[PDB]
C-alpha cells in the first residue's frame, strides 16, 4: 500500500564457512537511487565528430567520432567491486583466500517514491516538492539479453560505493553503426590526411527499443520488483600471482663452487665451462648451454606491438594487451601499455569533498610477472657467432623505417602455441566483476576488463524510467516537445552477490605478502572531520604460487 | 621481490620415512591422464593439400 514498506535495507557481507576449506561469501548491497525524468521521451540517433581535434596532424589517437542511440531510459549497473565490498572485506578476501568463484546474483527495487516539483510565480523563486501517489516508475529487466551489453564500469558509471550516499543511474545509450576513415599523420605532414565520416551501412543498422523487446513493469509507491536469482557459469578467479618467468622454470644448474662467506660480493659458480655443459637447448647449431639458451617447457607471456593503433570500418583503436610492463613494480613511472589506468569521480573513490572536474586516477601495477621488458630484447643472426657484431644483431636501440623513436619491439609479436598467461586480476574497487562473452564463432581466451566471463549468459541489464506525466495540454500531433510535469523518483535498490572462495594454505617457510593498515595509509580508510570519504585501490593477487 | 619469495623445505611439506637396512619404501601406482603420442610423422605442407 501507500504507507507500507516493501523491502529492507541490507549492506552486510556474510562469510559462511563450509566443509573442506570452502567459504560461502554473500555480499549484500543496498542503495538509494535518484532518477530524474529524461530530457526527452524520444530515441535519438546522434553522431559525434571531433574534426577540430583530429584535423590537427598527429592527433589521430584522439578520435572521438562515433554514432550512438540516445535513449530515454537509465541503466542500474552494479558491476563493480566497490558496489559490494568495503576495504575490510576485501582485505579479508585477498589475505585469506586463494581462489574465488562467482555463483549467483539477484537484485530488487523497493520503496518507490515519485515526487513532482512546482515553482511559484513569486518574484523571488521558490518551489515546493509534492508526492504523486499515482505516478508510476517504469522498470524493465532484459533477462534474455536482447539489448546491447553496456557495462557501466568502463565509463565509471556504476552505482556508488557508499551505502550512506545516495546514487544515480546512468542514462542508457548504445552504439549505432558508422563508417569512418582517418589516415594518420605527424607534426610536419603536408596537406590534409583523409579525415571523413562516411555515414552508416544499411546492412548493419540495428535500432533497439526497450518497449519492443522487454516487458516493462509499472511500479507505484506500494510496488516492488525482484529479478530472481541468476546463477553464473564462470571459471574460477585466482587470488595468487605467478613470479616465475622462463628463466625460473625447471631444475637450476648445479653449482660446483658455493660461497664460504656471507655477503653480496660472494656468489656461487657453476664451474663447468659454458660450451662443455650438459643439458638441452633448442639451438641446434651451438654448444653453449646457458640460462638464456637452455630449453624451457613453454613460454610465459608474449611480446605484443605496444601503442599499436589498428583501423577498421569504425576508425582507429588501440591493440589490447593482456599483461603489464616489466620493471614497473620497481618504478611506477615506467608503467605503460598493459597497465590498466582508472579515472573515476566522487561516487567511486575520489575524495568526496574535492572541488573541480579533474578526476582521480591510478594505474594498476599487478603483482604477476608475466610481462616483458622490451629494452632488454634483441634479435641476432642464425649463425650465432659470439660476441655478436653490429650487422648481425637487431637491438631495441636500432631504428625501424628511419624513425629514431620506433624500434623492432614496437612492431613485435611472439604469441604462439607455447604461450602461457594469466587472467587479469580483480581491480578493487573500480574494476568490473563479470563480462559477457563475445558472440563470435571463435572467442577470445580472456577479457582484459573483467576477471569473470559469462559463457552462456549472465544477468539481464536493469532499466528504469519515470513514466510520462502529462499536463492537460498534451497534443500528440504537435511537433514541439512534450509538455510534462517535472517528475522524479527515489527508490531503494538491493542486490545480493554470492561468491565461493577457498581458504589459502601456508606452503612455504616464509610469510607471504599481505595487505595491512599502516601509518601512511591509515587516513585513506576513515572519514575526514567534515564528512569526506575516499576509497583507494587495493591489489588482489597478493600471495604467490608456483607456476611450474 | 618480497612478494615473490618462496622458500620451500621438504621437512615442512612432505612425510619423511626413515629407512634402516631392513626397511623398504613403495610409492604406489600413479595413473596418468595425458593425451596420446603419435609415432608417425606428417609430410604435407600447404602445397600438398587437396
UniProtKB/TrEMBL annotation, chain A:
<keyword id="KW-1173">Viral penetration via permeabilization of host membrane</keyword>
<feature type="domain" description="Coat protein VP1/VP2 Parvovirus">
    <location>
        <begin position="1"/>
        <end position="517"/>
    </location>
</feature>
<dbReference type="InterPro" id="IPR036952">
    <property type="entry name" value="VP1/VP2"/>
</dbReference>
<dbReference type="GO" id="GO:0140267">
    <property type="term" value="P:symbiont entry into host cell via permeabilization of host membrane"/>
</dbReference>
<comment type="similarity">
    <text>Belongs to the parvoviridae capsid protein family.</text>
</comment>
<dbReference type="GO" id="GO:0005198">
    <property type="term" value="F:structural molecule activity"/>
</dbReference>
<keyword id="KW-1164">Virus endocytosis by host</keyword>
<keyword id="KW-1140">T=1 icosahedral capsid protein</keyword>
<dbReference type="GO" id="GO:0019062">
    <property type="term" value="P:virion attachment to host cell"/>
</dbReference>
<keyword id="KW-1162">Viral penetration into host cytoplasm</keyword>
<keyword id="KW-0945">Host-virus interaction</keyword>
<keyword id="KW-1161">Viral attachment to host cell</keyword>
<keyword id="KW-0167">Capsid protein</keyword>
<protein>
    <submittedName>
        <fullName>Capsid protein 2</fullName>
    </submittedName>
</protein>
<dbReference type="GO" id="GO:0075512">
    <property type="term" value="P:clathrin-dependent endocytosis of virus by host cell"/>
</dbReference>
<keyword id="KW-1160">Virus entry into host cell</keyword>
<keyword id="KW-1165">Clathrin-mediated endocytosis of virus by host</keyword>
<dbReference type="GO" id="GO:0039615">
    <property type="term" value="C:T=1 icosahedral viral capsid"/>
</dbReference>
<dbReference type="InterPro" id="IPR016184">
    <property type="entry name" value="Capsid/spike_ssDNA_virus"/>
</dbReference>
<keyword id="KW-0946">Virion</keyword>
<dbReference type="InterPro" id="IPR001403">
    <property type="entry name" value="Parvovirus_coat"/>
</dbReference>
<dbReference type="Pfam" id="PF00740">
    <property type="entry name" value="VP1_2"/>
</dbReference>
Amino acid at each position: 500500500g501507500v504507507g507500507i514498506s516493501t523491502g529492507t535495507f541490507n549492506n552486510q557481507t556474510e562469510f559462511k564457512f563450509l566443509e573442506n576449506g570452502w567459504v560461502y561469501i554473500t555480499a549484500n548491497s543496498s542503495r538509494l537511487v535518484h532518477l530524474n525524468m529524461p530530457e526527452s521521451e524520444n530515441y535519438r540517433r546522434v553522431v559525434v565528430n571531433n574534426l577540430d581535434k583530429t584535423a590537427v596532424n598527429g592527433n589521430m589517437a584522439l578520435d572521438d567520432t562515433h554514432a550512438e542511440i540516445v535513449t530515454p531510459w537509465s541503466l542500474v549497473d552494479a558491476n563493480a567491486w566497490g558496489v559490494w565490498f568495503n576495504p575490510g572485506d576485501w582485505q579479508l578476501i585477498v589475505n585469506t583466500m586463494s581462489e574465488l568463484h562467482l555463483v549467483s546474483f539477484e537484485q530488487e527495487i523497493f520503496n518507490v517514491v515519485l515526487k513532482t516539483v512546482s515553482e511559484s510565480a513569486t518574484q523571488p523563486p521558490t518551489k515546493v516538492y509534492n508526492n504523486d501517489l499515482t505516478a508510476s516508475l517504469m522498470v524493465a529487466l532484459d533477462s534474455n539479453n536482447t539489448m546491447p551489453f553496456t557495462p557501466a564500469a568502463m565509463r565509471s558509471e556504476t552505482l556508488g560505493f557508499y551505502p550512506w550516499k545516495p546514487t544515480i543511474p546512468t542514462p542508457w545509450r548504445y552504439y549505432f553503426q558508422w563508417d569512418r576513415t582517418l589516415i594518420p599523420s605527424h607534426t610536419g605532414t603536408s596537406g590534409t590526411p583523409t579525415n571523413i565520416y562516411h555515414g552508416t551501412d544499411p546492412d548493419d543498422v540495428q535500432f533497439y527499443t526497450i518497449e519492443n523487446s522487454v516487458p516493462v513493469h509499472l511500479l507505484r509507491t506500494g510496488d516492488e520488483f525482484a529479478t530472481g536469482t541468476f546463477f553464473f557459469d564462470c571459471k574460477p578467479c585466482r587470488l595468487t600471482h605467478t613470479w616465475q618467468t622462463n628463466r625460473a622454470l625447471g631444475l637450476p644448474p648445479f653449482l660446483n663452487s658455493l660461497p664460504q662467506s656471507e655477503g653480496g660480493t660472494n656468489f656461487g659458480y657453476i664451474g663447468v665451462q659454458q660450451d662443455k655443459r650438459r643439458g638441452v637447448t633448442q639451438m641446434g647449431n651451438t654448444n653453449y648451454i646457458t640460462e638464456a639458451t637452455i630449453m624451457r617447457p613453454a613460454e610465459v607471456g608474449y611480446s605484443a606491438p605496444y601503442y599499436s593503433f589498428e583501423a577498421s570500418t569504425q576508425g582507429p583503436f588501440k591493440t589490447p594487451i593482456a599483461a603489464g610492463r616489466g620493471g614497473a613494480q620497481t618504478d611506477e613511472n615506467q608503467a605503460a601499455d598493459g597497465d590498466p589506468r582508472y579515472a573515476f569521480g566522487r561516487q567511486h573513490g575520489q575524495k568526496t569533498t574535492t572541488t573541480g572536474e579533474t578526476p582521480e586516477r591510478f594505474t594498476y601495477i599487478a603483482h604477476q610477472d608475466t610481462g616483458r621488458y622490451p629494452e632488454g630484447d634483441w634479435i641476432q643472426n642464425i649463425n650465432f657467432n659470439l660476441p655478436v657484431t653490429d650487422d648481425n644483431v637487431l637491438l631495441p636501440t636500432d631504428p625501424i623505417g628511419g624513425k629514431t623513436g620506433i624500434n623492432y619491439t614496437n612492431i613485435f609479436n611472439t604469441y604462439g602455441p607455447l604461450t602461457a598467461l594469466n587472467n587479469v586480476p580483480p581491480v578493487y574497487p573500480n574494476g568490473q566483476i563479470w563480462d559477457k562473452e563475445f558472440d563470435t564463432d571463435l572467442k577470445p581466451r580472456l577479457h582484459v576488463n573483467a576477471p569473470f566471463v559469462c559463457q552462456n549468459n549472465c544477468p539481464g541489464q536493469l532499466f528504469v524510467k519515470v513514466a510520462p506525466n502529462l499536463t492537460n495540454q498534451y497534443d500528440p500531433d504537435a511537433s514541439a516537445n512534450m509538455s510534462r510535469i517535472v517528475t522524479y523518483s527515489d527508490f531503494w535498490w538491493k542486490g545480493k552477490l554470492v561468491f565461493k572462495a577457498k581458504l589459502r594454505a601456508s606452503h612455504t617457510w616464509n610469510p607471504i605478502q599481505q595487505m595491512s593498515i599502516n601509518v601512511d595509509n591509515q587516513f585513506n580508510y576513515v572519514p575526514s572531520n567534515i564528512g569526506g570519504m575516499k576509497i583507494v585501490y587495493e591489489k588482489s593477487q597478493l600471495a604467490p604460487r608456483k607456476l611450474y
